[PDB]
Subunit: 377 residues, 2 copies
C-alpha cells in the first residue's frame, strides 16, 4: 500500500487556491489542517485537472463534503464540549471549501452554507466571546448581524470600544474568512461587526448581491451609534475582494462616518467579464443571480467615478498580478485620491495577495489602531 | 511576471513533510501559514529534489532562515505587543523548519534552537497562560522545565489539577510540536509539563539523548508530587515519536505513577539503522552525538523487553506504513500487553499518522480525560 497523498498534478493545479483554503491561523474562525486537504484530494479522480470546468468543482464539492461529514461524525460522538467545538469548526471549514467555488446546484450550495451557519451558532454557545446576534431590518430586508466583543470584555470595566465593520467578498463565508480577519481587531481590544448583506454569507443564492452595499453599512453605523458599548466616533470599514470594492464605495458615500477604511484587493472596476479566468464568470453570475449575457452591463454599472471625493483615510493592499481588479485602475485611484489613500502593492502577488495575508494583516491592524489614535483614542 | 509559487516537483517531493510543517492549528505554539512555505520554497534552486542529500537540507535551512529573519524584522518594527508576539511566533516556526532536518553545522543548528527558545520566552511575557519555568537538577544535569496552567487558572478558585507530561521526539522542538499537543490538555483544564531532557529541545546537539529518559520523568513526577496546585494521583505521560518509545519505557519502569500513558507512533524497537530512509541516519547520529558505525549497537540497546510488565493503561496511535517503528513490532507489543494496551492503527498512514493528527488528538485528549475520570476525577 502507498500512504494517502495529494497527486503532484492536482496540488500544482490548485496552487492559486491553497493560500485561500489555509487562509489565516485562527482561534475562533473554522480552519482546515493539511490532513483535511489530503482527505479531500487523496481519492480525487485522475484526469480531472481543469479549474474552469464544472466537472472539477462537482468532484471538489463531493470530496470536501465527505471530509465535513467525517468531522460531524467526530462532533456527534465527542466526549467533551471542547472536542465537540473543535470537530464542528473543522466540519464548517470543510463544508465552506466544498461550496465556495461550486454553483451548479443552488439548493446544495445554500444547504452547505446553512450547515456552516448552524456549526457557527453552535460554536458561539461554548465560546468565551460575547456575540450579539440579531437581524438589522433595512426596508424589507432582514440582515443577519454579529457584534463580537474582545476576550474577557465587561461593559462595566470598559469605556466605549472602537468597532471595525468587515464585509464579505464574492465567495467568502462570514464566519470563515471574515471572522478570521476580524480576530486581528478583536486581538487589539476592538469590537467587530460582521454581517450578511443581500447575496452575502447565508444570503448567497437567496438574494442578489447589492451594488450599493453602503446602504446596509449605514444601518450598521446607526446601530453602533445607538449602542452605548461602542464609540461610534472610532469606526473602521474593511472589505476583502469584492467587499474591498464596497470599501471604496463606503469611502465615497459615507466616509465621514469612519476614521479609516481598509480595501483588501478590491478595485474601482472589474476586468472584462467575458475573459474572466477559472470559475469567476459563474461566481459573479451566482452572486448577482444573473446569466452570462447580463453580467458585462452590471460590471459597467459597478465601475466607480474615481473623481467623486474620498471622505476618509483609505489603506489598499493589492497584488501587481491581480487578474480581476487590475493594478493600473487601483494605481490611477491611488494617484487621484492622493494624501487620503495609501497603497501597499506586492510585486509578484495574485488577487488578494494571500501568500502575504499574515504579514499584511499585522500591518493593516496596526494601521487601523494608528488611525483611531490619530482621532484621539 | 509569474506569481510566487512552490514548484510542482518540490511540493510533491516534500509531501511526507508537509503534514509535519503545518502540524496542528494552535493558539500558543508557533505555526507557519501557507504563504511562509511559499516564501521558503518559491526561490528554492531547481534540480535539487533529493530528500536524502545534505545539499537539499542546506538550501532548506538557508531559505527557511530568510523567512524567519523577515518575521523578526516585522516583530522589531511592530507597533503593538499583540503584533510583536504574532511575528515572533511566525519567526520561531520558520527557524524550527529551517533546523529540524539540518545537522551539518552543529553551531548553526544550536543557534536556530536558541532563536526559537528566545522567541518563546518573549511570547510568554505577553501571553495569558501561567508558565512556571525552572531547571530540574537531575544529578549534574540542569533540565529546562515548563509547568503551564489552563487559561484563567487561579490556585484559590481550583482544586489540584490533573497534569500531562509530554516528551519531545527526535527532531521536535518543545515549544513547537509538544506545546501544540499540550494545548489539547490545557483546553480540558489540565496542567501540562514540557521539558528538555538530555539531547532534547534546547539540549539537542549539546548533550547525547538519554535512552533511560524515565530517570528524568521521575524527577518531574517528584516536582508535581511537591506542587500543591497539581493532583499527582492524576498524571499522564505522552510521547511522540521517539518520545513515544520513552512512553513505553515509562509504562514499564514507573507506570504506577500514571493513570494512563499515550504513545504517538513510538515503538519497542527501530528498523535497521543502515536502511533508514531520507535524513534519519544523520538525525539519529546528531541526537546521540555518535557516528554511523556506532548507531546499530545503540538501536540494539534501545530494543525493549516487551515481556517486562506494562504497569498502567497505554494508548498507541500508529500508521500501518510506518518505516521507522514497524507496525508488526507494535502489534506484537499490543497482543502481549493485552487489556492494558489499546492500538489505534491507521491503514494508509506513514510514521506519526500526521494526516490524522487533528482527529486522533481529539480522540487521545478525550481518552486521557476518561482515564482520569476512571481514577475518580
Ligand atoms: Na455608540
Ligand atoms: Na501535588
Amino acid at each position: 500500500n502507498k500512504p494517502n497523498r495529494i497527486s503532484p498534478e492536482l496540488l500544482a493545479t490548485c496552487g492559486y487556491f491553497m493560500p485561500r483554503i489555509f487562509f489565516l491561523n485562527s482561534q475562533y474562525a473554522p480552519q482546515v489542517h493539511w490532513g483535511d486537504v489530503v482527505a479531500a484530494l487523496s481519492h480525487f479522480p485522475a484526469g480531472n485537472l481543469d479549474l474552469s470546468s464544472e466537472e472539477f468543482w462537482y468532484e471538489w464539492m463531493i470530496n470536501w463534503s465527505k471530509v465535513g461529514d467525517s468531522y460531524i461524525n467526530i462532533a456527534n460522538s465527542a466526549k467533551s464540549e471542547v472536542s465537540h467545538v473543535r470537530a464542528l469548526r473543522s466540519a464548517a471549514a470543510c463544508y465552506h471549501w466544498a461550496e465556495f467555488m461550486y454553483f451548479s446546484d443552488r439548493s446544495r450550495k445554500i444547504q452547505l452554507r446553512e450547515y456552516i451557519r448552524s456549526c457557527f451558532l453552535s460554536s458561539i454557545k461554548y465560546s468565551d466571546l460575547l456575540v450579539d446576534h440579531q437581524y438589522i431590518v433595512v426596508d424589507k430586508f432582514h440582515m443577519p448581524f454579529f457584534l463580537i466583543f474582545p476576550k474577557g470584555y465587561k461593559e462595566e470595566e470598559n469605556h466605549p470600544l472602537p468597532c471595525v465593520i468587515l464585509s464579505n467578498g464574492l465567495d467568502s463565508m462570514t464566519e470563515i474568512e471574515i471572522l478570521s480577519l476580524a480576530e486581528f481587531f478583536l486581538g487589539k481590544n476592538m469590537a467587530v461587526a460582521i454581517f450578511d448583506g443581500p447575496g452575502q454569507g447565508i444570503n448567497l443564492g437567496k438574494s442578489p448581491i447589492a451594488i450599493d452595499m453602503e446602504l446596509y453599512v449605514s444601518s450598521i453605523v446607526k446601530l453602533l451609534e445607538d449602542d452605548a458599548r461602542i464609540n461610534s466616533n472610532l469606526l473602521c470599514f474593511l472589505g476583502i475582494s469584492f467587499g474591498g470594492y464596497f470599501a471604496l464605495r463606503v469611502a465615497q458615500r459615507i466616509g465621514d462616518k469612519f476614521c479609516c477604511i481598509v480595501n483588501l484587493s478590491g478595485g474601482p472596476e472589474i476586468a472584462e467579464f467575458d475573459k474572466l479566468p477559472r470559475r469567476l464568470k459563474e461566481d459573479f453570475q451566482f452572486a448577482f443571480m444573473q446569466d452570462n449575457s447580463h453580467m458585462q452591463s452590471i460590471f459597467d454599472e459597478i465601475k466607480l467615478d474615481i473623481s467623486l471625493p474620498c471622505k476618509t483615510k483609505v489603506f489598499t493592499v493589492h497584488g501587481e498580478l491581480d487578474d480581476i481588479f487590475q493594478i493600473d485602475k487601483v494605481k490611477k485611484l491611488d494617484q487621484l485620491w492622493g494624501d487620503n489613500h495609501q497603497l501597499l502593492c506586492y510585486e509578484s502577488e495574485a488577487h488578494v495577495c494571500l501568500n502575504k495575508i499574515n504579514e499584511y494583516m499585522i500591518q493593516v491592524s496596526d494601521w487601523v489602531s494608528e488611525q483611531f489614535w490619530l482621532n484621539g483614542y
